RNA sequence: AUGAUGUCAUACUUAUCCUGUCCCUUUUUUUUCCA
């Protein structure tokens, strides 16, 4: 219903960490 | 195939100017109209001899009688009763809907 | 219209205050007196003051135009 | 705690829902209490907001602004929060989008300027030796952004200690990637640190690992490209082993060493560049046979860099590099690729500019006779670019005959619409100039043979070749062949296909433009009556080319044609005015002006006035444009009585045409209208008092163009008199008439001056009505935008009141 | 919240410049001060009208145009009307016959007459003042004909030489009560042309 | 332009005035 | 997207969805949008916990954004009609046959099933006319309907009719109130709305699919089912709404027109 | 010949040079006239940079000729108003 | 006495413009019947 009940999971994920396999984008030999 | 009231007034003025038997001369004035369309529009709706009244008892009795005699021949039936074919067909359908 | 046209110097609106328009006119007059050499010489050499002293007085008077708002 | 967080979301909703002044006030209140709130709840409210996918571009720009303001107000207060901000910003630093990577670089710059380099260095030290290449590349990009923000000597001994560390070669590879990405981000800023970075990377340049030596060669090439042209000797310590390493490396490391050699070659000494070119030329002759596409691209880039390198001689290149380069790099497999063909073409143009285009032209003349269409197109494009770059001075006679035969066979086999090949044909023969005179009857015979073909496209291409080559046919003044071509095209004028007929008309227009009227066989008196029924055609290309030819004739050679035929042309041009392309109508108006300049402006004006009163359709504005062009070309005192008397016709559309023609006339004549302002003043005064909004709108356009025309000529009395009728019409609600009113007000403020506009707006800027004062404020805002400087002297004299002092004492000072 | 018209008349030096609805403005004193200057113009009257500007005529007739004197001295209107009357009697068969076979030399007068009418015979027209504002009328009250002065048609009709027969009764009756500020020259203020008063 | 003075109505076309024959009620209103 | 199986993982007691073991982790934005949708749907608490209505959401196995038809049923009645609508929206292969050549007969057979108010009522009409016809393959062949994909729709409708006591929803119908059917669909579809040749939430421009029943006669307010981009940003399974009962359902998501 | 939509950039002009296609060649970039092409067109920013190199400052065709201001727009000096490249918003 | 209101037609304006659009795969439970 409210806003920050959708933000406590994102706050817990920000306090926990982040993995490179999640949301992996491929980019190489850029200029 | 639509007919605006402006075109009806122009057609009435053209019939009162150029008589009856000229139609291409009439259809020269009306844009996007043909002479056959002008003749059909005059003889179907805009002629002053068309009885734009209500049906009498005698007219309805003769219409029901002649529709019983000659079925679905309205171009033959209509000059006998004096109305046009569309008006008498519509009134016969209305009388059958009233009888049902 | 444009956002920068309303954001331009000297711009206004239908609900613009008279004191705000007068303050903008006074600030534009002070900026025109500071920019023009002949106007600053006419308003400076009439009194016994230097040109840079008159420029500093006009810079103080630019802030003084926002002195008594309402 | 809870109240501080509630105030944090209160400032968040005020920023994201309130006005941008209220958002700026909320940002100022947040930055004033940024030390009071702390970096903890600020990070806990910002990094979920930064990770939110629903933010717009203005939302993320405001987020970057709030992060920058909080970082500037916090400085070292986010020292425990370096790791969380780093792991949020590390996908933002690896952003594929340009604006997202710029925002990530700005966030990295804010984190480096706020927290400190040592905390980020200790954070990225376990991430330097990461096993995955993507994590190592993300760490390399983040450390390069931190080194670019904090400067090179802030972490250059630290980077030297990382690259000198023998704990793991992956950390050394990451450090060389840090050096290369920091050099790519810096460019010219790494110029004083070039010797230090070269001494740091000289240990990694001789590394036994293939990937570490490959990234060392890539970093050396990036340092050579970034520090152009300084620091030639600073990389000279890498000049000895890498030239040995090009004799030792194979595969991708050999290509990286060749790229580093090609980036280091144009900066060295000339004897050193000659020795290095002679050393690496054998490896390049080996590498022409390499089937790898990226290796061949690196070889072509190195060849272009060596050709751009000065001091590499001329005969040495043409004796060493060019025959195996032409044997290997010139094949159908090279032309089948897209980017490799363009790179080969650019390299061939650069080599022909470096060492003369005659050798390349003689060695690539047979490839125009090849059966492959794309290969012949690439050879023709390279030949056209070389001829447009250098010229045709070095072409031999047998070489010129081979070029003419090659381009004739190339035009003879043209399956597609190769218009760039047609432009290349025009470029080659125009570069040859007067030397094509022996080859001209062969070209003419082949074109006249292809004009009898079954296909319409062949005849269209042949007439396009005539239109391209008419200028160079007339350079030698061989008028017999060009006259014979004109006679054959006059016979071909009765074609039924429209594209072919338009191409023949364009070729005839080119021939008339390059010959002249007096030596034009068939003559103009026989040509223009043949062109008269062609104007009745309905196709657009035929109409455009034929109206262009008629305009060239009527501008240049109108003396051969009687006035009856010109009036017949004008009566056809009236029907031609109902076309669709605007260029056709513009050229039609220009032909009307040319005919009126030729034969006299009276009967054509009566014809145009009857067309204006007779059309009543979605045209006839061009009739007014033609009337204005006729009057501007033919002394508008001669036209204005008939145009003024045409206003008396009550036919409800000719008056708007008269006023629109007057507006177009004033816009055409400009400053010459001051003789006729007093003539057109009562006509505009009677037009502005009309009931219809069309008359008022078009008269407003008349006032606008007349005010902009004769500005600075003392006609402000009639302009003010017209403004006395224009300014009552400011209450109109239709958009076209109010746009005409706004344009007329702008023109009157330019012409008369801002003082009278300020006098008109001062009594209505403080109007009690909302809409009236809103419109007056719009007009005054436009006047103040146009005349901000001049409104100070034209400001009204208002005395000082109780709110503030108003009467300036500086204006009362007298010297 | 806002004062009446008496306070605005007492505060401002010009009570005639105060409007009927100027008191409901946010700055009535500033509007009265701006309206009292010498070079101001009033609001056009369409802001109070429901009718749009110059829109509700709908039934009147007007003369088409009055050309200036030099254009009529060139005389383009005569053969222009003759050409229009000749073209009005033509048929469309004759119209395309003339279209494929043109006939020039219709007017063919000169270039020097129009050159003289543009330059030598160029006359400066009558232009109104800077503060003039045209409205729905502004074409009928052209007297601003001075009061206290009889017109030329009434002087010619009553046989007044330039001594009207009613001027003796006008002198013996003093000034009229309808226009007390009007001064009649020759009998009350001792008058060029028909304007013998002000 | 065509105008009906009894109705005080402008007409774009000739058939607009030809169809303007409301006009009886406007004529009865303008009769007095 | 993982919107079907986030509810499946939450129904099996797993709360650490972002820290669950996998061969490779799914992106956190997909889980964030799935949890935001399940917040907008009536299945998650204020603490991100499954309700008993969430157990009703996860009982029957079709997608939750489709399974809000069932919880919208008995709030607007008409349960069987939206049940058959969800049966045609649960198919895998495409409905209707558009062969090489023919075209005109297949297009006329498609137009003969058209109803005002989107193609959900068209699919309901297809299942209705397939009923009282013997469920014959000859009817589907004569009307250019695939007899492989809509038998699957019949089996899905049969399975969902069997799974009605576990959700405790009766066999309800209206027989004419298609406004109630579209209101129940709008109660099920509040997140999938776009208007103004533009998304009302994501602000992305939209283009109507030519195979839709409302390719011409462009609407005033419409919802959808899918947003597949192939050449233009397309419009799959549109439906006519008025944005009047749009504020009646999901009031937290919907504000300011 | 204008439209009420299509505000252009309102950005500060730079050293990039405007460019016109042949379909709308010869038009003024502001008032859409054809009289006295006097002042060259500056197109401020990344309107020139990137994929939009040498394109039209009007409709969007491949540009062939230098765009110009007319003398009438530079009478009030509207050429300093900013970038005239059309951004479709 | 001129204001609002309706896709009804006819005039008119902008040197308006002659023009484009049909998805690769595929997976998700439980209960009665006649000599
Ligand atoms: Zn009437
Ligand atoms: Zn263009
Ligand atoms: Zn311009
Ligand atoms: Zn720009």
mmCIF file of N, CA and C and ligand atoms in Angstrom, chain H residues 20-21 24 56 58-61, ligand 2:
data_model
loop_
_atom_site.group_PDB
_atom_site.id
_atom_site.type_symbol
_atom_site.label_atom_id
_atom_site.label_comp_id
_atom_site.label_asym_id
_atom_site.label_seq_id
_atom_site.Cartn_x
_atom_site.Cartn_y
_atom_site.Cartn_z
ATOM 1 N N UNK H 20 21.365 21.795 -44.634
ATOM 2 C CA UNK H 20 20.011 21.729 -45.170
ATOM 3 C C UNK H 20 19.899 20.667 -46.251
ATOM 4 N N UNK H 21 18.791 19.930 -46.233
ATOM 5 C CA UNK H 21 18.520 18.979 -47.295
ATOM 6 C C UNK H 21 17.870 19.690 -48.479
ATOM 7 N N UNK H 24 13.820 20.874 -48.538
ATOM 8 C CA UNK H 24 13.469 22.163 -47.959
ATOM 9 C C UNK H 24 14.627 23.144 -48.103
ATOM 10 N N UNK H 56 19.703 17.338 -41.610
ATOM 11 C CA UNK H 56 18.869 18.515 -41.783
ATOM 12 C C UNK H 56 18.586 19.176 -40.441
ATOM 13 N N UNK H 58 15.984 20.965 -40.296
ATOM 14 C CA UNK H 58 14.546 20.937 -40.516
ATOM 15 C C UNK H 58 14.357 19.431 -40.656
ATOM 16 N N UNK H 59 13.282 18.989 -41.324
ATOM 17 C CA UNK H 59 12.585 17.698 -41.293
ATOM 18 C C UNK H 59 13.400 16.445 -40.976
ATOM 19 N N UNK H 60 14.589 16.315 -41.556
ATOM 20 C CA UNK H 60 15.462 15.237 -41.140
ATOM 21 C C UNK H 60 16.133 14.481 -42.264
ATOM 22 N N UNK H 61 16.075 15.024 -43.474
ATOM 23 C CA UNK H 61 16.707 14.403 -44.612
ATOM 24 C C UNK H 61 18.214 14.563 -44.600
HETATM 25 ZN ZN1 LIG J 2 14.916 19.160 -44.760
#
